Amino acid sequence: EANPFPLEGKYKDESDREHLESLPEMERETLLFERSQIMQKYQERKLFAAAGA
């Protein structure tokens, strides 16, 4: 499974970063929260896979 947000742990790539940086503050913070949940689940799966689950 590939890291879904490899740029600064929060963005897909440069155009995605620029898009999020152009948004209103509330929308940006909501998307960053959503992405932090995605990243936690990604890391948890990576950990379980490394242990042989």
UniProtKB/Swiss-Prot annotation:
It comes from the Eukaryota. Residues 9-32 have a biased composition (Basic and acidic residues). It is found in: Nucleus, Nucleoplasm. The PAF1 complex is a multifunctional complex. Involved in transcription initiation via genetic interactions with TATA-binding proteins. Involved in elongation. It regulates 3'-end formation of snR47 by modulating the recruitment or stable association of NRD1 and NAB3 with RNA polymerase II. Also has a role in transcription-coupled histone modification. Required for activation of RAD6 ubiquitin conjugate and the BRE1 ubiquitin ligase which ubiquitinate 'Lys-126' histone H2B. Present with 6510 molecules/cell in log phase SD medium. Component of the PAF1 complex which consists of at least CDC73, CTR9, LEO1, PAF1 and RTF1. This is RNA polymerase-associated protein RTF1. The lineage of its organism: Eukaryota, Fungi, Dikarya, Ascomycota, Saccharomycotina. The chain holds residues 76 to 128 of 558 of the full protein.
